[PDB]
Amino acid sequence: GTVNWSVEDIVKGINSNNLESQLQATQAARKLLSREKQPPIDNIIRAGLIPKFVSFLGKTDCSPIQFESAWALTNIASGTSEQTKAVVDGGAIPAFISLLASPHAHISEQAVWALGNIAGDGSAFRDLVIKHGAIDPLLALLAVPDLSTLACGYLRNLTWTLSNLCRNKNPAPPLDAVEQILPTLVRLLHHNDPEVLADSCWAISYLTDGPNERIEMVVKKGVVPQLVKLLGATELPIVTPALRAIGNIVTGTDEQTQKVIDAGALAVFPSLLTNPKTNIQKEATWTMSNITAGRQDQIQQVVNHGLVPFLVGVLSKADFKTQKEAAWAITNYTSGGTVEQIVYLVHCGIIEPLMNLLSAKDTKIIQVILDAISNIFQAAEKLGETEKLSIMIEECGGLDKIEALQRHENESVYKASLNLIEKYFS
């Protein structure tokens, strides 16, 4: 009967000179800390029980108390940064790394979980876990010919902990640690378990969220095709991280973006840009805006895949944040595209939704829209069709909005709107 003990009784049992009494009190603490309703983490810390639990982690001759203390410390480290710090201050990191080699699978799994919570606190504890040498034993746990031989929950916890070791920035994980972990991540990215795939994609998304040198590290491993395949998955928990990773990769060089295009990613965007989940639509439009900012042949690839109508649709109706990303994609398109591509964009019906979005209350969207207008007008000038475009913008009510923007707080807004009125409507 280790249910509903008091912290006083737990302290009494742990302070006894009896290993079994300590085990029973530690189990009672674990059950207290594993309750969904307000676990008394702070009361357990104030009682000074963390050093005892950490010392129990090293009792190799009593694996049950090792497991119970590891579980208790895992739940303590799952709380606030101060509580995770309390666990780290007790010396738990090296003790958990030692437990990673335990012959009992459930004890090593608990150690993996605990290290995941500690690393997940932030960059400092992540790097400290790495400095204590956790990556080597962690990856050794996955050194099997077929990952399907490992228990499902075991593999899921290992993947989650590895993802936390790739997470957080300022600073990002050490380059050498990323190179150490990446091959195992690639292997996990081909596992059939949805949660393992979701956490592997999340890890890749963390690693691709950075400079082009970090993006290049990931792309060199040839994971882009697999990311695109997972981008076409049905499980939203997999698509979300895969889209974030692909979006992070297209923020890099035009050659890295091209590697994304060559894998067939654009063929999936018809569904992503119409996805019922607002965040998928927003992230997809943000990826498109970073693709339309590339070379003209890449804009042409966007055109050939029939994605301009989908951008027009998102600009016409979507969450405002998605509409903003679409406005960005249009401005990038018009800034880097040919006259023929900018003419095709107009022929697809961009002007009317572009105008309708000039009634928004966000200064940035208005600047973005008005810069796309300028680019389209420049293309019209190059074609000598400025009057046509002028008539079109006037027929849909854009003229009134631009004239009304001449009297706007932001200076860039009234100067550009006044330059447009004077250069094309006088």
Binding site: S34, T74, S78, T84, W113, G116, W160, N164
Partner: peptide, 7 residues
């Protein structure tokens, strides 16, 4: 992201 082990 941290996870509490409830069971």
């Amino acid at each position: 992201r941290k996870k509490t082990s409830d069971s």
